[PDB]
Amino acid sequence: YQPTPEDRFTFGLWTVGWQGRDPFGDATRRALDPVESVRRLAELGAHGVTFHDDDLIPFGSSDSEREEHVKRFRQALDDTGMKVPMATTNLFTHPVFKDGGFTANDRDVRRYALRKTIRNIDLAVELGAETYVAWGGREGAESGGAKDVRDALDRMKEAFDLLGEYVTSQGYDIRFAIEPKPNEPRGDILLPTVGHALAFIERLERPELYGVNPEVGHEQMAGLNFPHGIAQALWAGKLFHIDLNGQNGIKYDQDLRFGAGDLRAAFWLVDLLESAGYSGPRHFDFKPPRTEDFDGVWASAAGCMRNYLILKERAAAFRADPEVQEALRASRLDELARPTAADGLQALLDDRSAFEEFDVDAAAARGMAFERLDQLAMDHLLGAR
Amino acid sequence: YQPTPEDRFTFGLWTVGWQGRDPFGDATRRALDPVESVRRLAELGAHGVTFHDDDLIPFGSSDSEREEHVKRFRQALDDTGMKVPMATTNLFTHPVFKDGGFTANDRDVRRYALRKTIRNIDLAVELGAETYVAWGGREGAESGGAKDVRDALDRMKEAFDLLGEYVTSQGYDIRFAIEPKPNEPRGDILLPTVGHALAFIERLERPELYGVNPEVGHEQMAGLNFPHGIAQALWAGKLFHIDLNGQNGIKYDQDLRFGAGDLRAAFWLVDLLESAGYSGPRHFDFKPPRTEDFDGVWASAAGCMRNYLILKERAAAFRADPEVQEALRASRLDELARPTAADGLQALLDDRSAFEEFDVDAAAARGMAFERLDQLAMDHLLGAR
Amino acid sequence: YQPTPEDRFTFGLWTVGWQGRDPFGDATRRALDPVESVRRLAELGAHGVTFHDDDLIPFGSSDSEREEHVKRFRQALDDTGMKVPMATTNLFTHPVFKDGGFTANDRDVRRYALRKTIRNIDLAVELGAETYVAWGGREGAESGGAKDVRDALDRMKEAFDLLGEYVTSQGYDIRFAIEPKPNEPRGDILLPTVGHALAFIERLERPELYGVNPEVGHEQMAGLNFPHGIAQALWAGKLFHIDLNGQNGIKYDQDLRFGAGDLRAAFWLVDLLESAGYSGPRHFDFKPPRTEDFDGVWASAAGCMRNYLILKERAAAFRADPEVQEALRASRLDELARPTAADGLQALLDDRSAFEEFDVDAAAARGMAFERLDQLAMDHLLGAR
Amino acid sequence: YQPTPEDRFTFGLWTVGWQGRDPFGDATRRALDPVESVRRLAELGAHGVTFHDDDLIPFGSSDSEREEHVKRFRQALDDTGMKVPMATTNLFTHPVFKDGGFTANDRDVRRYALRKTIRNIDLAVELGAETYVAWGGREGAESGGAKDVRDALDRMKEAFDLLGEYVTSQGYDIRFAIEPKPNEPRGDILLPTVGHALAFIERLERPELYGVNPEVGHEQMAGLNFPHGIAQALWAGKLFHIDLNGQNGIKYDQDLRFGAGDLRAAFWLVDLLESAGYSGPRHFDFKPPRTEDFDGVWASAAGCMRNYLILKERAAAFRADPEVQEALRASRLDELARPTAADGLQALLDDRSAFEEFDVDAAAARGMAFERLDQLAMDHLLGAR
Ligand SMILES: [Mg+2]
Ligand SMILES: [Mg+2]
Ligand SMILES: [Mg+2]
Ligand SMILES: [Mg+2]
Ligand SMILES: [Mg+2]
Ligand SMILES: [Mg+2]
Ligand SMILES: [Mg+2]
Ligand SMILES: [Mg+2]
Numbered sequence A, B, C, D: 001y002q003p004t005p006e007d008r009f010t011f012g013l014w015t016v017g018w019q020g021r022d023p024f025g026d027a028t029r030r031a032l033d034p035v036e037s038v039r040r041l042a043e044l045g046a047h048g049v050t051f052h053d054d055d056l057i058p059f060g061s062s063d064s065e066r067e068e069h070v071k072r073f074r075q076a077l078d079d080t081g082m083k084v085p086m087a088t089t090n091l092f093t094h095p096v097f098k099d100g101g102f103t104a105n106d107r108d109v110r111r112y113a114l115r116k117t118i119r120n121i122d123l124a125v126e127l128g129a130e131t132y133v134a135w136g137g138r139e140g141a142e143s144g145g146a147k148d149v150r151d152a153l154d155r156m157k158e159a160f161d162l163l164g165e166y167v168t169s170q171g172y173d174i175r176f177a178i179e180p181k182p183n184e185p186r187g188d189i190l191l192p193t194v195g196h197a198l199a200f201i202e203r204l205e206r207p208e209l210y211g212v213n214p215e216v217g218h219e220q221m222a223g224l225n226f227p228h229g230i231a232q233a234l235w236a237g238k239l240f241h242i243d244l245n246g247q248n249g250i251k252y253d254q255d256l257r258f259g260a261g262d263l264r265a266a267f268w269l270v271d272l273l274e275s276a277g278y279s280g281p282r283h284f285d286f287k288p289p290r291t292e293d294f295d296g297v298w299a300s301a302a303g304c305m306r307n308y309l310i311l312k313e314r315a316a317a318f319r320a321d322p323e324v325q326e327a328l329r330a331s332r333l334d335e336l337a338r339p340t341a342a343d344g345l346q347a348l349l350d351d352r353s354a355f356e357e358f359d360v361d362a363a364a365a366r367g368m369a370f371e372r373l374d375q376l377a378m379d380h381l382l383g384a385r
Helices: A034-044 A063-080 A107-127 A150-169 A193-200 A216-220 A226-235 A263-276 A294-320 A322-330 A345-350 A361-366 A372-383 B034-044 B063-080 B107-127 B147-170 B194-201 B216-222 B226-235 B262-278 B294-320 B323-330 B345-350 B362-364 B369-382 C034-044 C063-080 C107-129 C149-170 C194-201 C216-220 C228-235 C265-277 C294-320 C323-331 C344-350 C362-363 C370-381 D034-044 D063-080 D107-127 D148-170 D196-199 D217-221 D226-235 D261-276 D293-321 D324-330 D347-352 D360-365 D370-381
Strands: A010-013 A048-052 A083-088 A129-133 A174-178 A210-212 A282-284 B007-011 B048-052 B083-088 B131-136 B175-178 B211-213 B282-284 C009-012 C048-052 C083-088 C129-136 C175-178 C211-212 C282-284 D010-011 D046-052 D082-090 D131-134 D175-178 D209-212 D282-284
Touching: A010 A083, A034 A063, A034 A294, A048 B175, A063 A107, A083 A107, A083 B211, A083 B345, A107 A129, A107 A150, A107 B345, A107 B362, A107 D282, A150 A193, A150 B345, A174 A193, A193 A210, A193 B194, A193 B226, A193 C048, A193 C149, A216 A226, A216 A263, A226 A263, A226 B131, A226 B147, A263 A294, A263 A372, A263 B294, A263 C265, A282 A294, A294 A322, A294 A372, A294 B323, A294 C370, A322 A372, A345 B147, A361 B107, A372 C294, B007 B294, B034 B048, B034 B063, B034 B262, B048 D063, B063 B107, B063 B226, B083 B107, B107 B147, B131 D175, B147 B194, B175 B194, B175 C265, B194 B211, B194 B226, B216 B226, B216 B262, B226 B262, B262 B294, B262 B369, B262 D261, B282 B294, B282 C194, B294 B323, B294 B369, B294 C344, B323 B369, B323 C294, B345 D293, B369 D293, C009 C083, C009 C294, C034 C048, C034 C063, C034 C294, C063 C107, C083 C107, C107 C129, C107 C149, C107 D347, C107 D360, C129 C294, C149 C175, C149 C194, C149 D226, C149 D347, C194 C211, C194 C228, C194 C323, C194 D196, C211 D148, C216 C228, C216 C265, C228 D148, C228 D196, C265 C294, C294 C323, C294 C370, C294 D360, C323 C370, C344 D107, C344 D148, D010 D293, D034 D063, D034 D293, D034 D324, D063 D107, D082 D107, D107 D131, D107 D148, D148 D196, D196 D209, D196 D226, D217 D226, D226 D261, D261 D293, D261 D370, D282 D293, D293 D324, D293 D370, D324 D370
Parallel strands: A010 A048, A010 A282, A048 A083, A083 A129, A129 A174, A174 A210, B007 B048, B007 B282, B048 B083, B083 B131, B131 B175, B175 B211, C009 C048, C009 C282, C048 C083, C083 C129, C129 C175, C175 C211, D010 D046, D010 D282, D046 D082, D082 D131, D131 D175, D175 D209
Antiparallel strands: none
C-alpha cells in the first residue's frame, strides 16, 4: 500500500508542522523548517504541499526577507518535484482578526484582511496553485447582538466579489473554495456547513469561480453525514478541493489522521470520490497528536495515505463483486437512477397505475434488502471477502 | 400577553392532535376531531390551522367520504373565522413510504408519491393556502450503499420540477417551502439543514417558486445556531414560512412548546423576525408532552403564543433602549453595515492606509465591548431593565 | 465465521420481533410468535433469548392464558436447547407509566410498578434467568419542576431495596443489572450513564446484588467512549450483562445491528471483553430497520453475530502479534501496569529523583509512539496484517 | 443586584487572567498580576479567589522567588479581606504531562505529578483553603490501544489514596473534589461525568475525604442535564464545590460567563442550590471572550454574579408563589416525597389495591399538569409574574 506522487496526496505545512500547542498546553515539538517538511513528505510519497501565507513567510517580514523565504522554498520544490496545488490566507491567528477578517465589525480590519489576501493570491499563482481556499475561522460570534448576520453576509459577499474581480482583471487561472466549519474558535461560525457555503456561492456575482473545500471532521462536528454532503457538492459541480482527516463525533475539532474516527464513513467517502472520478488533490488537514515526537509525526502522515489506499482497494473490490452487483439490483439501486416520469406531467396525471389502481399494500410489503447489502459492504471493508 | 388573530399564530392539526404514541409507548390521549381543534384554537386566539392531507381525510377514504370531511372542516372555518395558510402531504406514515416518497428506490412509489401530493395541492388551493410545505422525512438512509445520493438528488429535483410545472400550468398562486431535518426517522435525511435546502433550490428549473420552512428544533439537532440560519434564509429572500418550537440540544426531535428549550435563542429569533419585518404565519410545530391530559394540551398551545408575545416585548424594549443603541455603536455594529470598499478594487489596492501604513497593533488592542452588550440583552430578557 | 451456542449469543424477543412502528410511521412487519423467533434464532446459532414480561404474556392476560403462553414457550426452549439468561419488566409502554414506574409522582403507580416487577421475577427464576435487567425508560422529565430529583432517587433506592429484600427472602439466585440511557423517550432520564448507575448502586442496602447492563448505543448518545465505560464497570466488578448494537453518533437511539455505527469502538470493545474474560451473555439489543422484510430481519440478526466473531479474530491477532507486543512496550503500556509508589508515601517524599532532581525536559521529549501503535491496530482491523 | 462578600462568589486567577490564546490564535490581552486581580475582584464584590500552583508561582521558580510571590499575594489578601477557599494543581500545561499526570504511562512522570501536587497542598492549607480540586485534564487517550483503562484507574486510585494518606498523616483539615470533563484536551478523558467520578470515589480507601466539583459546561458537553447531575451529587452527600459558567451545547468547552448558554438550566440550578442549602463557594470557572479588552473582562466577571443574583430572586419568587405551590400539588410533587411502601414488602405483596384491584385505566387518564407548572416557571423567570 505504497503511495506515489500519482496518487495526488498533499499536506499543509501546518499539519506535520503543528507544534502541539492546544488551549491547555505548551508546544511539545520544535518548529519545523518548511524546507525540511517538503523533503520529508517527498520521501514518504506525497505529491505536494499547501500553505497559509504566514506558514511560509513569518508575519511582519520585510519584502527582502519575503523573497528569501520564497526562494528557499522554491528550491526545495525543484529539488523534490513537489507541487503546490492550493494556498490560503491566515486571517485567524493575529489578534487584529479577533472579530473576523472579511466580516470584522471594524471596517479598517476588513480592508486590511482583503489586502493581505490579495498579496497571497499573487504568490499562490506564482507557485502554480490552482485553488485558493478561504476558511473564515473568525467570522462569527459568541453572543447574539455582536453580529448582525444579514449585514455580515453582505460584507462576506462584498469581499468574495472583490477577490473575483481581482483574479479576472489579472487574468489569473485560479478558483476559490470555501471551507466550512460550524464552530471553534468562534462560538458559531458563519456558513457553518457544506450546504450553507453552497447556497451562499449562488448569490455571488461570478458563481462559476467559487466551490467548496469540505473537511471530514467539520461536517461531523455538526453530526452530519460527510459522504452525503460531498455527494451534494459533486451534484452541484462544486467539489473543487477536499480536506481529509478523522473525528470522533461532536466535540472540538480533533483533526485526527485520515481513517481514524468514523472508519465506515471514510470507506463510503473513498467509494464516492473514486466512483465519481474526483480528480483533485487528496489533501490531509490533520494534526499529529501532541503525544508524538517527530518519528510519530511522519508515521501519522504515512498512515493518512496508507489508510486511503487500503480503503480504495476495499471499495473497488466491493463494487466489482458480482454478488454485490446482484444485491444492488435486489435493493433497486438501478431503479433509483431511472427517471420518475420521463413520460411527462400529463402522462403521469393520466396514468391510473400511478394512483387509482396502484396496489399500495403490495408495494409496501416488498423488503428493501438493505441489511444484506450493508453486511456485504462490512465483509469487504474487513477483508472477510 | 393576549394573542389575537392579527398576531398570525397558526397550529398544525397534528400538533394539539398528537395522541402521544412514541417509539416506546401507546397513545395517552384520544383522537381529536379536526372540527373541535379548530374551535378550541380559535377561542385561544389563533389565526389559523395547517394540515397534512391524512390529518383531514383518513387514508383510503372514498371520494364521497372525502367531500364530507372537507365540508365539515370548511364549516368550522366559516364558523370561527380561522384561515388555512399552509398545507402539506403525509409521505411518511404509510409503510409504502418506508424508503421515501420522492426518492424511494422503487419508481412506482415515487410516481405514487407525486400523485398523492398533486391531489392535495388542489385541495390546499381550494382552502386558500399560500404555502405548500414538503418535509421529506423518509428521504434518506440508514446505511451507505442503500442510497446513491447523486441519483436521489436527481429524483428530488425531478419531483419538485414536476410540482412547479403543475402549479404554473394550473395558474395557481401557491409557493413551495422545503422543511429540512438532519435525521429521525431515517438515520440521515437528505437536505439536512437550512443551508443544504437553500443550495438545492438554486438548481431547480423555476427557483423563484421555492423557499424554506425551517424549524427551530431541527437546526438545533445539528447543534447549529437557528437565528443565524434564519438570517441567511432572509438574506437570500427565501424565508416563506417558519415552524416554531423548542428543543434541548442534540437528541431526538422533542417538539417542545415554543420558548422551552433554548430560551436565549428564542429571544434572538423573535428579535430578528420582528426587526426584518417577516410577515408570514408564526406557525407552531410542537407536541404537548404525553404526560398531559387535554387541559394540558390547551395550556401548552396557549404557552406557545404567550412566550412569543413576551419575547416580542423584551426584544422591542432592548432595541429601543438608548443605552443599548449606544452599546451597539461602541461595538461597531454601525460599521458592519457600511461597505468595506464602495470606493472599488483599484482604490483599495492604492490605499496605503489599508495595508502598508495600517497600524495592526492599534486596531488589535481595541476591545469589541460585546460582553457589556450581551449583559444588556440579558437584563432586558429577564426584565431587570 | 459461524456462531454456535458456545459463543453465548442472545437476543431479546423484542429485537427480531420489532414490527417497525416508529414515531412517524406504522408497522411494516407483522407480529412474530415468540415460539417462531426461538426456533429461527436457534437455527442461526444463537444460545438463548430474553424477554420483557409483556413480550411473552400479552398485557392484561388471565392467569389461565398466562400459563398457556408460558407452556408453549417452554416447549420451544425444550425443542431447541435455547436458554433464557436474562429477563426484564416492561414499565414503559402502557399509558399508566407515562411519568415513570418506580419514580412516578403518583404513589399508587409506583406500588403497581413494583408488584408487576415482582411477578415477573418469579417467572424469570422459573425459566432459569440469572440476571434481571431494569431499564427505567420513563424515569425522568421534560421540564425542571416536574421531578424533584433527590426525592426521585429516594424512590428509586426504595424500589431497588424492596426488590433486593424480596429475592433474598425467597432465596433466589438472581442478580439485578441497571441499564442506563441518557434520554428518549423522556427529555432526560435518571441515571443517564454507566457512571451514574454505578454510583447509585453503592447507596443501595445490599450493593453486591446490583450491577450494570450498559448498551453500546446509549453511552454513545452522550458522546462517551463505550469501551472506557465498560472498563470502569469491569474495574468495579459490576459488568453483569451487556447490550450490543450500533449507533451513529448523538441522535435518537438507532439500535443498529452490532458492528454498524462506530466500527473502531466495536473492535476495542471486543478486545476488552475477550481480554478481561467476560463470561456473560453477548446480548444484542437491536432493531432490524423497518425497510426490511423478514428475510432482512434474519440477515440482520446473523450479521450481529458474524461481526462479533470477525472482530474477535482481528483483536486476537492484534494482541498476539509480536510487533504489536513490541509497540506496546515502546508506548510504556507495561509501565502503566506497575505501581506508581509501592515503596510508600514516605519513600516517595524522600525520593529526590521524583522532584528535586527529576529532569522534566528529558521526560517531556520522549514520544509516546501512540500513532504507530494505532496504525498497527488499524492494519489488523482491516486485514492488511 | 449588588454582590457582597456574604454571597460567597469566588473566581480563579486563571479566569479574569486568561490572555485569550486559543488553538488558532495568539493572546489578545496582556498578563495580569495576581495582586491586581485580587484588588479588582474585591472591588466588584467577590468573596475570594482560587489558584493553580502555576498561576501564583511561575513554573520553575526558586524557593526564594516562591516565598516572594506568596508574600505579595498574602499582603493583597490582607489588604482586601479576600479569602482563598480552594486551590488546585496544574498537571496539564507543561509538556511533561502530555500523556497525563496521575495516569501517565511513564512511572517517573506519575511520581513527579504526585510530588508537585503534595507541595501545593501544603501551600493551600497555609492560605486557608478547605477544598483541593483535581481536574485530570490530560488523563485519557486519543486512541484505543494507548491506555489500558483498568490499569489507569488502578493508578488513579493509587494517587488519590496516597494524597488521602498524606493529608491524614499531616492532620490537615482539607477535602478533595474531583472535577469531571468528558473530553478536551484529550480525545476522551477518564471519569468523564459527575456519575463516573462519584462511582470512582466509592472505591477509594477513605471515601469520606473525596467529593466532586462539577462544572456547568462540562456536563453539557455530554448533553446531560446539569441540575439533575447536581441533585445526584447532593443526594450522595458529595457536592463539595461547584464551577459556574455557561455553554451552548455539545462543542468545545466555551466557559462563557454564568447565565449565558442554557439560561433555563441556570435557573433550575440556582433553584436547587438555594433550596438544598448548599453553603460552599459559588465559584466561576469562566473565560472572558478574547474579543474583549480589560474593561470587558471586568464587565464579564460582574455579569457572572449579577446573573446568579437575578436568578436567585426569580427562583425564590417561584417557590413562594401560592399559585405555584398549588400547581406543585396538582402535579403530585408532594406524593413523590412520600415513601412508596413504608408499610413494608409483605404488606405490599398482600395489598390487592396495588395490583389485583388497581384500576390501571383510571390512573393512566390522570394528566400530570406539568405544562402549566412549567409555564408558571417561565413567567417567573421572565418577570411576567
Ligand atoms: Mg479541522
Ligand atoms: Mg481544513
Ligand atoms: Mg420537529
Ligand atoms: Mg416542522
Ligand atoms: Mg437502544
Ligand atoms: Mg438495551
Ligand atoms: Mg470548562
Ligand atoms: Mg472548571
